[PDB]
């Protein structure tokens, strides 16, 4: 497996202690208001989700464009990579329906020859072992990053490829393996062309096929995001899962990689409104909520290094969100940098910032955050 | 109360309801499996990648249906507010006349939680009569009998469109609402018109029964999620005296309750979803409860669907048969007893007891 390249810094996003680290991860169906680009702007690494603007723009190519450029106006400094999925043909990309279009055999076909899908039946899925599609899919993201306010990109369904048993149940056992191989390939073509520019992956991941836990495969990469973070299986319990999950966390952003951490607070703000009635409006500080964002940010600060970012979500379309542009007030408080590493014993786990102490309690999902 | 164009019903063995979508066309064996329900709605995107729209996959479709079993009743669902995708003809429609769509007092478009799925503003008097005559026009066909009309409730729940729209607007388009109703309740009074609409809510004080009038019966959904602060039992004692009420009244009753809870297993997202065993124990006992819930409240023309969602290719109960469906069942010997919240109910071939409160059932088969 690719190794990890000597760590370069000067690409990449601004990062501070000061107070809390975040990460903005985002799509929304027309123009962002002046007043969300502001917000944009604010944070110091963004990407761009899939279904960028395009009902506004046309397609999510020009959408991003428009989106990045108006970021970039109001903060140069911010960080804005351009979300791909390196097997999963998504819609509302100009660019790929016409290459689709044009050249159907693009598309993985199962040994009998039929087209492949997502659970909705409907989304299919880039071929990339064959050599044209390997190119279109290289120059679309190759030409994007080019461009002068995308500092890099997202590459997402990584653990899709990596998984056997994703591809292998649908297109054989061989045809994984060669979709892992060009895979790898693929990566390792962007890590060279995209050397001045950021990469970060959707790649660490507990996995019982993975011995590491994502960490070997991070060396094609400038760090990773990471999500199903709290979400156990495998019959693992919910803190076993979690303490795995810390560990390669840990060991990522301790060697230099950037970790841009998801947590969902959906089911915490669900309150069965919404469906055949208007959403009811969400207390943002109310206290159990508060508790939750206590708890879900204590899993992140336990395992935070420099270039490590946190974002507590509602969803990814900015619209749906019910924290869209707000700001907790534990994102406002002085954090300061750490005092030392996280300690483990059993399920709980402190840590000490220079303006905060942590305590964690995996078991009893509960966490203090005691702010000085 | 008109008979005359109701679906079969038998006792005999459990009353089906199928309701149900694929982006392609059915199989044959498909074909047939459909063709084995008494009572069958096609959903929206019905096999528009083979057809080229929902229209014509749903001609497709029904024709194929009745030519394996005539007896079959077929239903078209059209929303009443919600313009989704895959009509060919709505696409040409709003095309043509973007002022079709609902807007607010800036004269935004507003949508679904998705974004990006806009309504029709039934208020204008062009938009209405475009609607209507879709639905007629495809009823009147010679393989489909009836129609399915959804977003009633998002339409009579003032909330839902006042929030978006104006308080205003929202009185306007339940206005115009009433009257599509009262028309459809006419034109199509040779055929079948199901609504999804009992429903327990607090705006309604009968829990949907109050808007049956218009209708041959009701589509049932969110039967067992509670909401607005009532634990489950009490909000499913509400829904099942709605139903008893309205199956005891002659109306056609399709209740739908989902097993996706009860056959998840973590796995399908990143992986290869496992096998779900569809003879498992703890999978029957939760079949046997939801079968129980609807058999407390079934009379002639009660139908279940106990799904995993209604799209065929991502079903793992698609083509199944559970035994519960296989064994006699035989006519009620008497209306359910509610004691508590455990009700007991006798058939010929079958005693049934539930217990709300701890979600389980027992299905005494004879």
Same mark, same amino acid.
């Given at each position: 497996l690719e190794q990890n390249q000597?760590? @370069? &810094? +000067?690409n990449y996003p601004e990062f501070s202690w000061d107070t809390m680290p975040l990460y903005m991860h985002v799509r929304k169906n027309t123009a962002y208001t002046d007043e969300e680009i502001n917000y944009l702007a604010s944070f110091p690494l963004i990407t761009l989700e899939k279904s960028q603007a395009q009902n506004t723009y046309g397609s999510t190519e020009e959408g991003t464009l428009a989106t990045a450029s108006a970021i970039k106006l109001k903060n140069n400094k911010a960080k804005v990579l351009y979300y791909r999925n390196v097997v999963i043909n998504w819609g509302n990309y100009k660019n790929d329906d016409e290459f689709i279009s044009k050249n159907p055999s693009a598309l993985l076909k199962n040994q009998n020859n039929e087209l492949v899908y997502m659970p909705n039946g409907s989304t299919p899925f880039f071929d990339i072992t064959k050599s044209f599609v390997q190119e279109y899919w290289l120059k679309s993201v190759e030409d994007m990053v080019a461009t002068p306010n995308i500092d890099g990109t997202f590459i997402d369904a990584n653990i899709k490829v990596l998984v056997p048993s994703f591809f292998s149940s649908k297109v054989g056992v061989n045809k994984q393996a060669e979709i892992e191989n060009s895979y790898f390939s693929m990566m390792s073509r962007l890590k060279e062309s995209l050397s001045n520019n950021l990469i970060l992956a959707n790649i660490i991941r507990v996995r019982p096929e993975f011995e590491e836990n994502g960490l070997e495969y991070? $060396? &094609?990469?400038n760090g990773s995001y990471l999500e199903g973070? @709290? +979400?156990?299986?495998? $019959?693992?319990?919910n803190a076993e899962y979690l303490v795995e999950g810390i560990e390669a966390t840990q060991k990522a952003a301790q060697s230099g990689k950037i970790i841009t951490m998801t947590l969902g607070l959906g089911e915490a703000i @669900? =309150? =069965?409104?919404?469906? @055949?009635d208007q959403r009811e409006d969400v207390d943002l500080n109310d206290e159990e909520l508060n508790k939750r964002v206590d708890y879900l940010l204590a899993i992140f600060l336990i395992c935070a290094e420099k270039y490590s970012y946190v974002y507590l979500h509602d969803g990814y379309l900015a619209t749906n969100s019910?924290?869209?542009l707000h700001q907790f007030d534990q994102y406002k408080k002085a954090l300061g940098a750490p005092l030392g590493k996280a300690i483990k014993n059993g399920y709980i786990y402190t840590r000490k910032f220079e303006n905060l102490d942590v305590w964690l309690n995996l078991e009893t999902q509960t966490a203090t955050l005691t702010w000085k």
């Open positions: 000597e760590i @370069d &810094y +000067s991070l $060396g &094609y990469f973070f @709290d +979400s156990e299986a495998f $019959g693992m319990s @669900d =309150n =069965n409104t919404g469906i @055949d019910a924290v869209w």
